[PDB]
Amino acid sequence: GASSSFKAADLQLEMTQKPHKKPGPPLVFGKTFTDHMLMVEWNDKGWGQPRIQPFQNLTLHPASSSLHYSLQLFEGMKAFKGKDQQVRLFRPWLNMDRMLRSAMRLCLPSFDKLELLECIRRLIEVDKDWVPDAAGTSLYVRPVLIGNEPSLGVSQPRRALLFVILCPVGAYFPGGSVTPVSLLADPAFIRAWVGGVGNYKLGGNYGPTVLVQQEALKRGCEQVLWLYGPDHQLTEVGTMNIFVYWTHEDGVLELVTPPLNGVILPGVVRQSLLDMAQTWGEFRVVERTITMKQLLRALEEGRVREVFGSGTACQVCPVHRILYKDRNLHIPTMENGPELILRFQKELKEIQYGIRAHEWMFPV
Amino acid sequence: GASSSFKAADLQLEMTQKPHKKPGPPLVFGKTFTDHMLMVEWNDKGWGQPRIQPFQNLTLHPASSSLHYSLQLFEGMKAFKGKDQQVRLFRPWLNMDRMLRSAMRLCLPSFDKLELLECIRRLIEVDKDWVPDAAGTSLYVRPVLIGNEPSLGVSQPRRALLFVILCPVGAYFPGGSVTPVSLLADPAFIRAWVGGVGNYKLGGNYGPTVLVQQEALKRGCEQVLWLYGPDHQLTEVGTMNIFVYWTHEDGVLELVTPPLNGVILPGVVRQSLLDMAQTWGEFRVVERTITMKQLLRALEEGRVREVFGSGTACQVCPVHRILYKDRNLHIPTMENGPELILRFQKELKEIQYGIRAHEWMFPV
Ligand SMILES: *Cc1c(COP(=O)(O)O)cnc(C)c1O
Ligand SMILES: *Cc1c(COP(=O)(O)O)cnc(C)c1O
C-alpha cells in the first residue's frame, strides 16, 4: 500500500491517575517500568494519532499475527541523565533507521523516523523523573512494532501496533573499571545465516538463544560466542558485537570487527567504537572476518591484546576465557589493562553524561 | 524446574452467552473463529486448571516475552466431520509430540500430551456444530504456547499461556482432482539452517517468509521453493514438505523426500505419505537429499513423474513449474495423471471422513 505516517504534532496525552512508586537505591534489568507508554495503531486507514497513555496491558485478538508468526520487532536505546538533570539519548537516529529496516523486512508499515523520535522525546519528558542520575545508571527505551491482524494466514498484516515502554537500569561496573566474562564457543548452535534475518532486530532471533545460554551456564560460561561457517567465524557474543584488538598476521596492530555481510546485527555501539577509533587515527581499524584458527594462532603467539563485546547493555564488555572444543582458552584482555576498553568506556561516559558536548547526544 | 501438568479431569467450562452466527455456504482460511477457546496458565506454582471459555481477547503485559523475543510456538491439525456427523482428528498424537519438542526448544513448560489432547477433544465437542460437513471441508485446530513473563530479559519464562482456537475451513479442490502451483527457487532466501530451529513449528520461522512470498508473487509464482546449501538442496515448498516421484539415477522408480537432518519440519502428512507408500510396497520409498542438479538432469531425461508438497492445508499439492536462475522449468506432474497424488488424496479422504475405519483417526 501507499506510505503515510503519524505526526508528533498530533500527539494525545493522558496522564496517569495512579502513579507507581519509584524504586529505592535495585534496578534489575527489564523488570521495572515507568508510569506511561506510547501507543500508535495502524490499519487500512493508515496510522491513527499517537498517544501517551498510562502504562497498561495490551488487548490482543488470540489470532494476532504477532503471536503466531512472530510479526514483531524491537529496538533498544538508552537515555542518560547528567548531574545537571538534563536527559540525553545516545545516537537515537541510528536506532530509528534500524527499526524501519526491520519493519520493511517483515512487511510492517513504515513511518517517519523523526516523528517517532519526537514522540519518544515527549514520552521521556513526561517520565523524566524516572531517569536515574547515579553514576553508570540509565533509562532503557524499548520501542516495539507488531503485526496485529486477526488472521491465521501467513501474510502481510493489515493492522499493526507500535508502542514504547521505558525501564530504569542500574550500573554494570564501578566507575573506571570493568569485569570480564567467559564464553562458550560451540559450533553446533547457529544464531544466524547468510540469507536469513540475523542482521535485523526481530524477536524471532532471540527466543532460540534461551536454551543455548542455559547450555553455556551449564558448562561454566557466562555468555555464548556465536560461530559461523566451516571456518568457525566469530560473529557475536551474546547479544553484543565482537571486537578484537591484536597484532594481525601481517604484523600490524589493529582493531577488527566482523563485516556486515548478513549475519551481524549492525550495533549502534559498534558503529560508535569504529567511528571513535577511526577519528583517533592511532592504529588500523578494519571490518574483516575473524576465524577461530586465526585467534588460536594469535593467542599462542602473544598477539592478542583485548577481546570484547559491545552493545547498549554494558557498552564494552571484556572477555577473559573461551571454551572451544573442550579446551579452555585464556584470553589476556585484563593483563593488557584493558587499556583500549577503558579508553572507550571513558570517552563514552563523558559524551553520554554530558561532561562534554557532542553531536551524538540528542537532548530530551 | 520440576515438571507438572494440568489435567483434563480438572477442566472448567464456561459457555458463551453471545454466540456468533455461523458462516453461510465462504470459509476463508484462518479468519473465522468458533464460539469457545481453551486456555491454561502456567507460573512458578505450576499449571492452573484448564478452562473452556468464550472466545475472547488476550490481556498481555506490554513486556510479555511472547512479543519481544518470540517465545511462541504453535500447532495445526484438522478435524473432519463424516456424513454421519461424527467428528475425527487426524493423527493428533503426532502434533502433540511435535508441540512438546517445540516447547522444550524454547524453554517453555512441558505438559502431558494426552491431557492436552483430551482437553482439545472436549473443546471440539462443545463447538461440534462449527465443524462443516461439505465434501473437502474441515475444522482447523490451532494450539499455541507462549511465554508471558513481564520482563525484557532474554531468559527462560517464569509464566506462560497455552490456548487453542478453532476455524472452519473450506475445500481446496473439487472431489477427485487437483490443481497445480508454480514455485520460485531463489537461493538468496534461506528458510532454515543446520544448527537452527527450522525443524520446530516456532513462530519465528514464519514471519521472515512473508516478504519472500511477496517476491514470489511479483515474479509470477504462487509459492516459494526453499533451497539450502551450495548444492541447492530442495527442502520445503511454502509451508509444506516436498516429494518427488521419479526414476532415480540408478534406474529405480522411487518416491523421495528430504531427510530430517535439521532443516526440514517433520510434517504429519509427510510421515503419513511415507507410511502409506511403504505399506503398499510397490516402489522404493526413501529419505535422501534432492538437489537442483539432480532434478534438472531428471527433467531433461524424462525421469520425473510427479513433484508435490504435503501439509495439513491441502494435503497434497502438485507442482507444474519452477522458476530457477531465471529459467522457467516445466514440471510434468499433470501429464502423469497425477496418478500417485490422486491415489494419496483418495486414501486420505477415505480415512479422514470415516468411509473406512483406521487407527490414524481419533474420534471426538
Ligand atoms: C542489539 C544487538 C547488538 C548490539 O546493538 P547495539 O545497537 O549496540 O545495542 C548486537 N548483536 C545483537 C545480536 C543484538 O540484538
Ligand atoms: C506445518 C509445516 C509443514 C507441514 O506439516 P504438517 O504436519 O504435515 O501440516 C511442513 N513444513 C513447514 C515449514 C511447516 O510449518
Backbone angles phi, psi at B202, to 5 degrees: -105, 135
Of A56, A58, A57, nearest to A18 by C-alpha is: A56
Distance B312 CA to ligand 2 centre (A): 7
- Phi, psi dihedral angles at B300 (to 5 degrees): -65, -35
The residue length of chain B stands at 364
Quick one: cell of A267? 550495533
Technique of determination: X-ray
Using alpha carbons, list the distances in angstroms from residue A39 to A13, A32, A155, B174, B347.
11, 19, 23, 46, 52
| Alpha-helical segments (H) within B1-112 | 65-68, 92-105
Strands, E assignment, chain B: 12-13, 36-43, 46-47, 51-54, 58-60, 72-74, 77-81, 87-90, 138-147, 160-169, 181-185, 223-228, 233-237, 240-247, 253-257, 284-287, 304-311, 315-324, 327-330, 361-363
Domain annotation for chain B: domains and CATH numbers: 1-173+350-364 (3.30.470.10), 174-349 (3.20.10.10)
Calculate the alpha carbon distances from B146 to A219, B49, B158 in Å.
Answer: 27, 17, 11
**CA atoms of A118 and A5, how far apart (whole Å):** 13
Q: Name the residue among A152, A153, A210 with its Cβ closest to that of B155.
A: A210
Distances (CA, A) of B225 to A126, B209, B241, B330, B333: 50, 11, 10, 14, 16
Distance B140 CA to ligand 1 centre (A): 39
Residues of B in contact with A29 (CB under 8 A): 152-153
- Regarding beta strands B361-363 and B87-90, do their DSSP bridges make them parallel or antiparallel, or are they unpaired? antiparallel
In DSSP notation, A298-325 reads HHHTT-EEEEEEEETTTEEEEEEEEEET
CA–CA dist B103, B201 (Å, integer): 10
b/e string for B122-159 if b means 16 or more Cβ within 10 A?
bbbebbbebbbeeebbbbbbbbbbbbbbbbbbbbbbbb
CB B107 to CB A210 under 8 A?
yes
Nearest chain B residue to A186 by CA: give it: B195
Task: Say if A322 is an interface residue toward chain B (CB within 8 Å).
Answer: no
Cα separation, B317 vs B178, whole angstroms:
7
Q: Whose CA is nearest to atom 12 of ligand 1?
A: A239
Strand, coil or helix: A166: strand
Q: Is the CB of A236 under 6 A from ligand 1?
A: yes
Report CB contact under 8 Å: B163, A70: no
B82 and B144 in contact (C-beta within 8 Å)?
Answer: no
CB of A257 closer than 8 Å to CB of A284: no
Task: Return the C-alpha cell found at A208.
Answer: 532460540
- In terms of Cβ atoms closer than 10 Å to its own Cβ (0-12, 13-18, 19+), residue A26 is exposed
Q: Which residue has the cell 463447538?
A: B127
Q: Assess contact for B237 and B225: CB atoms under 8 A.
A: yes
| B286 touching A (Cβ < 8 Å) | no
Judged on CB neighbours under 10 Å (0-12, 13-18, 19+), A326 is exposed
**Are residues A210 and B37, on separate chains, in Cβ contact within 8 Å?**
no
A75 CB near ligand 1 (under 6 Å): no
Beta bridge partners of B247: B253
The ligand whose atoms approach the alpha carbon of A200 most closely is: 1
Q: Is the distance from the beta carbon of residue B240 to the nearest atom of ligand 2 less than 6 Å?
A: yes
Beta strands in chain A (DSSP E): 12-13, 36-43, 46-47, 51-54, 58-60, 72-74, 77-81, 87-90, 138-147, 160-169, 181-185, 223-228, 233-237, 240-247, 253-257, 284-287, 304-311, 315-324, 327-330, 361-363
Our answer on whether the CB atom of A314 is closer than 6 Å to any ligand 1 atom is no
Omega prior to A25 cis, within 30 of 0 = no
Distance CA B257, CA A170 (A): 53
Are the CB atoms for B16 and B52 separated by under 8 Å? no
Distance of CA A319 to the CA centre of its chain: 18
Burial string for B330-352 (b: 16+ CB within 10 Å, else e) reads: ebebeeeebebbbebbebbbebb
Residue numbers of B between 39 and 98 with CB closer than 8 Å to A: 55-64, 66-72, 74
β-pair type (B253-257, B284-287): parallel
Query: Helix, strand, coil: what percent of chain A each, to 5?
Result: 25, 30, 45
Contact B201, A94 (CB under 8 A): no
Q: Which of A60, A156, A214 lies closest to B57 in CB terms?
A: A60
Ligand 2 near B270 CB (within 6 A): yes
Q: How many CB atoms lie within 10 A of CB A218?
A: 9
Q: Pick the ligand that lies closest to the CA of residue B266.
A: 2
Q: At what angle do helices A113-126 and A92-105 cross, to 10 degrees?
A: 120
What is the identity of the amino acid at B186?
D
Q: For residue B305, give the DSSP letter.
A: E
Alpha carbon distance A324, B84 (integer Å):
62
CA gap A287, A281 in Å, rounded: 15
Ligand 1 atom closest to Cα of residue A95: 7
| B152: nearest CB among A63, A142, A196 | A142
